[PDB]
């Protein structure tokens, strides 16, 4: 039961409850999405309506974000009302009602909406594809619920029991006094939660290389590549991502997006090329691969990536920091590739 907090003399604070139950832990496709979507619905003693109306009069709002790793219940409110929000979030984990009607009336439609929005963005279909081909069921699980695998009300409750346990979550505070936070947390229904295990793995996940998947799609075409990275090798990939997404690379204008998704047991580097016509996409992805295969870096972007990594002051437990001062060269070895869109006119991993 971890509890951290960084104080300040501000008017607003922000409570967070990081639960290790993102898509990577989903026993069934989309079950993590549905649970995340179920958060803040009725609890056995307070209704979703009561919660909203009450928190509004206080001056605070809630939200539950889903990650590939976490399910984060977060609250933003006027500093002095801390215990209220500590308990509200506590009640969500300990006694969410899970009424059959809430699933059909609020949850399913919201997830249907989340999916609908994402379904129109090909880079997200590619990101899902990348994870799937390199981690065949680990973090490779679909991020959202799409109905290809039916999830019953019971499956969602089961997953709630599997993930909502003391040893599997981290309570975090911002502009909050750590003394009271720990006090209020122990004083809440958090401490009463059964302390299960913690599927947070230490051993590096099994990965795959040389894999490719193609999906026909109407709209923009997108060619992307994925690369599994070590728990130690992720330092150079962090600068690689920034280098390619900065003015230092004469090919940053050739790529839509590039980043390094970090986890405690490794990470995944992803680079996407997106454009209206397949011909433009093809040229870029080829020019990107060739220039990276003929590897080059020399770290002229070590100070830059050092700044960009710092402009992420929210993770009260982010990965390796000083690992930047090390390694400077880079050469594109093996990787994974996906083609979304005008597939019949996109490059195959074969010709890359």
């Amino acid at each position: 039961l971890t509890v951290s907090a960084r104080d300040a003399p501000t008017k607003i604070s922000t409570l967070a409850v990081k639960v290790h139950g993102g898509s990577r832990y989903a026993t069934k496709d989309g079950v993590a999405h549905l649970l995340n979507r179920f958060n803040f619905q009725n609890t056995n003693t307070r209704s979703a309506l009561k919660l909203v109306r009450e928190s509004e009069l206080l001056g605070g709002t809630f939200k539950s974000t889903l990650d590939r790793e976490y399910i984060t219940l977060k609250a933003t409110f006027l500093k002095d009302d801390l215990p209220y929000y500590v308990n509200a979030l506590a009640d969500v984990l300990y006694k969410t009602a899970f009424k059959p009607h809430e699933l059909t009336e609020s949850v399913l439609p919201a997830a249907r909406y989340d999916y609908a929005v994402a379904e129109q963005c090909p880079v997200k279909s590619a990101e899902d594809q990348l994870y799937a081909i390199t981690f065949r069921k680990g973090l490779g699980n679909p991020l959202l619920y799409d109905g290809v695998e039916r999830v019953s009300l019971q499956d969602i409750k089961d997953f709630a029991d599997k993930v909502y346990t003391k040893e599997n979550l981290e309570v975090s505070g911002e502009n909050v006094v750590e003394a009271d936070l720990k006090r209020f947390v122990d004083e809440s229904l958090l401490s009463t939660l059964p302390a299960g295990k913690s599927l947070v793995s230490k051993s590096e996940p099994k990965f795959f290389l040389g894999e490719e998947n193609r999906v026909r799609f109407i709209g923009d075409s997108v060619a992307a590549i994925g690369i599994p990275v070590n728990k130690a090798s992720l330092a150079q990939y962090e600068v690689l991502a920034n280098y390619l997404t900065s003015a230092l690379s004469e090919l940053s204008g050739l790529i839509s997006s590039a980043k390094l998704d970090k986890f405690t047991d490794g990470g995944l580097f992803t680079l996407f090329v997106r454009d209206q016509d397949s011909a433009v996409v093809s040229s870029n992805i080829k020019k990107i691969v060739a220039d990276l295969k003929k590897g080059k870096d020399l770290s002229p972007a070590i100070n830059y990536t050092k700044l960009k990594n710092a402009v992420q002051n929210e993770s009260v437990s982010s990965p390796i920091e000083l690992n930047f001062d090390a390694v400077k060269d880079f050469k594109l070895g093996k990787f994974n590739y996906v083609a979304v869109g005008d597939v019949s006119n996109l490059p195959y991993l074969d010709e890359l």
Partner: protein, 125 residues
């Protein structure tokens, strides 16, 4: 009259041995004289549904019971139009005359009540 109100008064009587021994028999008599069971209907099938609370409740009712309700209703209109009653072996028995919709109705009523209170809360500064 709200079912919450009916239940409040009914539970009170049902818990009281004195009132319960006095009223329930009269109520049992009333229900048999009512005759809806002879038409094959359960009491909950008789509740006027043209109001938001009942529409909410009927929406939430599980598929299988909903199909069952529909049958009892259709079968009843047919029986009534022929001016007959159903054969005894098709009459709803007391054991079967269960308040299947009631819990959904009480739930819907409580939610609307809270929503009404919250819509009209006063603030004390």
């Amino acid at each position: 009259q709200s079912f919450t109100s009916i239940a409040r008064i009914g539970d009170y009587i049902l818990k009281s041995p004195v009132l319960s021994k006095l009223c329930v028999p009269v109520a049992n008599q009333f229900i048999n004289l009512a005759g809806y069971k002879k038409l094959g209907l359960k009491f909950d099938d008789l509740i006027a549904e043209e109001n938001p609370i009942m529409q909410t409740a009927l929406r939430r009712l599980p598929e299988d019971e909903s199909y069952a309700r529909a049958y009892r209703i259709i079968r009843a209109h047919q029986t009534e139009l022929t001016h007959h009653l159903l054969p005894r072996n098709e009459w709803i028995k007391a054991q079967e005359d269960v308040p299947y919709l009631l819990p959904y109705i009480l739930e819907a009523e409580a939610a609307a009540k809270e929503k009404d209170e919250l819509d009209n809360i006063e603030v004390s500064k």
